[PDB]
Design an enzyme around this catalytic site. Structure first.
Site, short mmCIF file in Angstrom:
data_model
loop_
_atom_site.label_atom_id
_atom_site.label_comp_id
_atom_site.label_asym_id
_atom_site.label_seq_id
_atom_site.Cartn_x
_atom_site.Cartn_y
_atom_site.Cartn_z
N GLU A 33 0.83 -1.39 -0.09
CA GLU A 33 0.12 0.07 0.07
C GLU A 33 0.91 1.18 -0.22
OE1 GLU A 33 -3.09 0.75 -0.37
OE2 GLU A 33 -4.09 -1.32 0.05
N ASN A 44 -7.48 9.47 -5.65
CA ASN A 44 -8.28 8.46 -6.42
C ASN A 44 -9.16 9.49 -7.44
OD1 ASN A 44 -7.60 6.21 -5.05
ND2 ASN A 44 -8.40 7.16 -3.24
N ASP A 46 -12.21 9.37 -7.77
CA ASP A 46 -13.50 9.94 -7.19
C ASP A 46 -13.31 11.34 -6.53
OD1 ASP A 46 -12.14 8.74 -4.95
OD2 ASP A 46 -14.04 7.75 -4.14
N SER A 48 -11.26 11.69 -3.67
CA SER A 48 -10.93 11.55 -2.29
C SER A 48 -9.46 11.08 -2.34
CB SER A 48 -11.49 10.03 -1.66
OG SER A 48 -11.25 8.86 -2.43
N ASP A 50 -5.97 8.94 -0.37
CA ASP A 50 -5.50 7.63 0.42
C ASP A 50 -4.33 8.34 1.41
OD1 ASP A 50 -7.49 6.08 -0.31
OD2 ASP A 50 -5.95 5.20 -2.01
N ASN A 57 -8.48 5.95 3.16
CA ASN A 57 -9.20 6.79 2.40
C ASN A 57 -10.09 7.93 2.94
OD1 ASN A 57 -11.92 7.05 0.30
ND2 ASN A 57 -10.25 6.74 -0.88
N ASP A 99 -15.63 -3.15 9.95
CA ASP A 99 -16.57 -2.75 9.46
C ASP A 99 -17.57 -3.53 8.58
OD1 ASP A 99 -18.19 -0.10 9.44
OD2 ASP A 99 -18.02 -0.07 7.28
C1 LIG Z 1 -8.45 1.44 3.63
C2 LIG Z 1 -9.28 2.06 2.90
O1 LIG Z 1 -9.65 3.32 3.33
N1 LIG Z 1 -10.26 1.63 2.19
C3 LIG Z 1 -11.30 1.90 1.44
C4 LIG Z 1 -12.63 1.18 1.89
O2 LIG Z 1 -13.05 1.44 3.06
C5 LIG Z 1 -13.73 1.80 0.85
O3 LIG Z 1 -14.71 0.72 0.86
C6 LIG Z 1 -16.28 1.13 1.36
O4 LIG Z 1 -15.76 1.16 2.57
C7 LIG Z 1 -17.32 1.32 3.20
C8 LIG Z 1 -17.20 1.46 4.82
O5 LIG Z 1 -16.12 0.33 5.40
C9 LIG Z 1 -18.38 0.39 2.93
O6 LIG Z 1 -19.39 0.41 3.52
C10 LIG Z 1 -19.62 -0.40 4.39
O7 LIG Z 1 -20.21 -1.75 3.98
C11 LIG Z 1 -20.40 -2.70 4.84
C12 LIG Z 1 -20.85 -3.93 3.87
O8 LIG Z 1 -20.31 -5.09 4.25
C13 LIG Z 1 -21.61 -2.31 5.77
O9 LIG Z 1 -21.78 -3.39 6.86
C14 LIG Z 1 -21.19 -0.98 6.46
O10 LIG Z 1 -22.44 -0.60 7.22
C15 LIG Z 1 -20.63 0.04 5.52
N2 LIG Z 1 -20.24 1.23 6.16
C16 LIG Z 1 -20.81 2.15 6.59
C17 LIG Z 1 -20.16 3.07 7.71
O11 LIG Z 1 -21.97 2.68 5.85
C18 LIG Z 1 -18.47 0.03 1.54
O12 LIG Z 1 -18.93 -1.22 1.40
C19 LIG Z 1 -17.13 0.00 0.48
N3 LIG Z 1 -17.23 0.24 -0.68
C20 LIG Z 1 -16.88 -0.52 -1.54
C21 LIG Z 1 -16.93 -0.11 -3.23
O13 LIG Z 1 -16.35 -1.60 -1.26
C22 LIG Z 1 -13.43 1.63 -0.72
C23 LIG Z 1 -14.48 2.39 -1.35
O14 LIG Z 1 -14.63 3.93 -1.05
O15 LIG Z 1 -12.16 2.74 -0.71
C24 LIG Z 1 -11.10 2.15 0.01
O16 LIG Z 1 -10.31 3.01 -0.25
#
Ligand SMILES: CC(=O)N[C@@H]1[C@@H](O)[C@H](O[C@@H]2O[C@H](CO)[C@@H](O[C@@H]3O[C@H](CO)[C@@H](O)[C@H](O)[C@H]3NC(C)=O)[C@H](O)[C@H]2NC(C)=O)[C@@H](CO)O[C@H]1O
Length: 127
Positions: A33, A44, A46, A48, A50, A57, A99
């Site tokens: 990473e 990124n 979008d 945002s 990292d 992120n 999460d």
């Molecule tokens: C290390 C890093 O920053 N990684 C980033 C990822 O966190 C991000 O993925 C998105 O993350 C969010 C938050 O964890 C995910 O939403 C969660 O989804 C789960 C489903 O299993 C749910 O239980 C949670 O309630 C929900 N969180 C909240 C607070 O709403 C979301 O699914 C992820 N999206 C994707 C496309 O996988 C990704 C995307 O922005 O970026 C990484 O850099």
């Protein structure tokens, strides 16, 4: 700061087996990473960015003041993740891995560490 492999392993001991993820997983993820650099940043598509050793992120985890409509789930300025002291990154990572998606939240882990012998990443380290 640019950490050494074994140096980082010791620093991340609080993540060992956290949520069932052995230490080698975290060291492998940090390597791919940020290449063990606490100051690494990457923008990124979008809008945002990292931040740090674990490339956390800004759209979800921290505030950088330039990712409109983003969340700040770890309640910290993204700049805090760039420190030579990795505590902030370790504490935020714990929330991330809890999460729901586990370590799959880290794309490099998912693509380069998952399902490999991650034990090799702490070989030779006195832990
Ligand atoms: C290390 C890093 O920053 N990684 C980033 C990822 O966190 C991000 O993925 C998105 O993350 C969010 C938050 O964890 C995910 O939403 C969660 O989804 C789960 C489903 O299993 C749910 O239980 C949670 O309630 C929900 N969180 C909240 C607070 O709403 C979301 O699914 C992820 N999206 C994707 C496309 O996988 C990704 C995307 O922005 O970026 C990484 O850099």
């Amino acid at each position: 700061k640019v950490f050494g492999r074994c140096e980082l392993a010791a620093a991340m001991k609080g993540l060992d087996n956290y949520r069932g993820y052995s230490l080698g997983n975290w060291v492998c993820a940090a390597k791919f990473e940020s290449n063990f650099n606490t100051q690494a940043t990457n923008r990124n598509t979008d809008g945002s960015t990292d931040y740090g050793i674990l490339q956390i992120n800004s759209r979800w985890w921290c505030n950088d003041g330039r990712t409109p409509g983003s969340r700040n789930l770890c309640n910290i300025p993204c700049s805090a993740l760039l420190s030579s002291d990795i505590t902030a990154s370790v504490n935020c990572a714990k929330k991330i891995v809890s999460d729901g998606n586990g370590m799959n939240a880290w794309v490099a882990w998912r693509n380069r560490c998952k399902g490999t012998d991650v034990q090799a990443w702490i070989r030779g380290c006195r832990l």
